[PDB]
């Protein structure tokens, strides 16, 4: 129950010990979801880094957004993934929104306020309820077993999630910075706990 | 008798079984026509895909808009075609309007709100009336005999047709998104029937 408007988390150096953990009040099995976030780093030309990592008892990576060297964004909703391609890389803050549903299996990778393509994946798979939502390092277990290679150094914020599939217009409003009501993870009112070397600072990005 | 404003058809994967079919009330032999549509895919760098396919009893391809690898748009009004060239390819939604008349045989390929050139073809040829307007795969017969290579994966919408030759200004208004009255196929009020894996979703493109 705290606000983080105009604030962002900063990871100064690479380390497999520093990370934040977010908690949610979800109780029912997720079937269709959407997420949005902003981040800023420069590790692209050096190695791969983990952007978003979920967690469940049975599977290490229920939902996972990662960056693969010379490949681009990789999005996994289970034991499968899509390989979204990015030809060139620049240095600047980046927004990214994604959505998925079990009924159809479609996915949309909204990047910088623009769409890429609709693609199909894991039609029928139902997501779990209990989670350990870590941020800072990808985990291969319930909040543990981190590898320093995937560690992220830089800053991130503006994280938000919904349990429904947003229409193609509310994404534009999110991109423009308007007022809306997340139902799972709300940046306006959030609960978290942090360990290691992490700091909170005004978002340098616009 | 249904509306599809702000909606679009989505083909998730490649398959020669999924397709939609549109019906029209035409009764007289078409002599001059015009069409307009919007589509979005990324198959250009991989193979050729069929954009629009007509059908008649005597000829498999009465009217056909196709994309040829490293060549560009190909437009056939019968046993003849024009080879419209596109030097470079990008990834983004695309509009395309075309028109033809039997009296003169001229053709205009309006792309992204811009013209290319006037060219001549099949002056005298009269089009048929009965049709099987398929969308999703090119057909070499009356609605049958599909080849998976030509299948389209992506999304498409905003389809409209007229039985006259529009002046160079109404095309601009179409491009800007204004209200007009198609006389053959009307996106505002349309009849269709779909088979296979196809979905209806809000148009991600603007």
């Amino acid at each position: 129950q705290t606000d983080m408007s105009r604030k962002a988390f900063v990871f100064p150096k690479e380390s497999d010990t520093s990370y934040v953990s977010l908690k949610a009040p979800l109780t029912k099995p997720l079937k269709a979801f959407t997420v949005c976030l902003h981040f800023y780093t420069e590790l692209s030309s050096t190695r791969g880094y983990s952007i978003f990592s979920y967690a469940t008892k049975r599977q290490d990576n229920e939902i996972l957004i990662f960056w693969s060297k010379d490949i681009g964004y990789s999005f996994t909703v289970g034991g499968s993934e899509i390989l979204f391609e990015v030809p060139e890389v620049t240095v600047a803050p980046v927004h990214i929104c994604t959505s998925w549903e079990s009924a159809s299996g479609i996915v949309e990778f909204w990047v910088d306020g623009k769409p890429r393509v609709r693609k199909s994946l894991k039609k029928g798979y139902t997501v779990g309820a209990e989670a350990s939502i870590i941020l800072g390092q990808e985990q291969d277990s319930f909040g543990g077993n981190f590898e320093g290679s995937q560690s992220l150094v830089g800053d991130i914020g503006n994280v938000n999630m919904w349990d429904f599939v947003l229409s193609p217009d509310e994404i534009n409003t999110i991109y423009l910075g308007g007022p809306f009501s997340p139902n799972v993870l709300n940046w306006r009112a959030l609960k978290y706990e942090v360990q290691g070397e992490v700091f909170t600072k005004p978002q340098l990005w616009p | 008798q249904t509306d599809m404003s702000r909606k679009a058809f989505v083909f998730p994967k490649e398959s020669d079984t999924s397709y939609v079919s549109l019906k029209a009330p035409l009764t007289k032999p078409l002599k001059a026509f015009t069409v307009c549509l919007h589509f979005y895919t990324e198959l250009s760098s991989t193979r050729g895909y069929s954009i629009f396919s007509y059908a008649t009893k005597r000829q498999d391809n009465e009217i056909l808009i196709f994309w040829s690898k490293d060549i560009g748009y190909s437009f056939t009004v019968g046993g003849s075609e024009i080879l419209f060239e596109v030097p470079e390819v990008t990834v983004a939604p695309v509009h395309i309007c075309t028109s033809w008349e039997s009296a003169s045989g001229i053709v205009e390929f309006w792309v992204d709100g811009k013209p290319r050139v006037r060219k001549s073809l099949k002056k005298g040829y009269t089009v048929g009336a009965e049709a099987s307007i398929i969308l999703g795969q090119e057909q070499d017969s009356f609605g049958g005999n599909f080849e998976g290579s030509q299948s389209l994966v992506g999304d498409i919408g905003n389809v409209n047709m007229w039985d006259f030759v529009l002046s160079p200004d109404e095309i601009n208004t179409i491009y800007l998104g204004g209200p007009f009255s198609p006389n053959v196929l009307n996106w505002r009020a349309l009849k269709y029937e779909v088979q296979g894996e196809v979905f209806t979703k809000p148009q991600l493109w603007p």
């Epitope: 990576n61 996972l64 990662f66 034991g79 993934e81 291969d140 | -």
Partner: nanobody, 114 residues
Framework: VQLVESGGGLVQAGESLRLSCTAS???????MGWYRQAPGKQRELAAL???????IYGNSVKGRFTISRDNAKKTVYLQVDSLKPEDTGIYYC??????????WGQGTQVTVSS
């Protein structure tokens, strides 16, 4: 869980080469590719075939080889051409499903006769 390779090194400067790989698993939902490991440096990615109708290519070697995705079987191809001296080294090949699970291949060495 399994992997097999077929190819030869000792190739002359500029000529072609055909390498191949096989496994005991379907390729549906498995992006398969090739990585290069020259002396020193580090194991890098030559090029791979996406899951659905696309082929990523290593920036270093543009228009260098072809992914030649196999279907119904496991037989990846490169169609080497314009073999230059810098091509010498190990050529790893593997299929990775999801990050942290790639079941690394064994790779095959290739030399460049001057």
């Amino acid at each position: 869980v399994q992997l097999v390779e077929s190819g030869g090194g000792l190739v002359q400067a500029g000529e072609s080469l055909r390498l191949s790989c096989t496994a005991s698993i379907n390729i549906a939902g498995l992006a398969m590719g090739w990585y290069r490991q020259a002396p020193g440096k580090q194991r890098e990615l030559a090029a791979l075939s996406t899951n659905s109708g696309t082929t990523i290519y290593g920036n270093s070697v543009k228009g260098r080889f072809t992914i030649s995705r196999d279907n119904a079987k496991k037989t990846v191809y490169l169609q080497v051409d314009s073999l230059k001296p810098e091509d010498t080294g190990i050529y790893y090949c593997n299929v990775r499903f999801n990050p942290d699970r790639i079941y690394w291949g064994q790779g095959t060495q290739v030399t460049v006769s001057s």
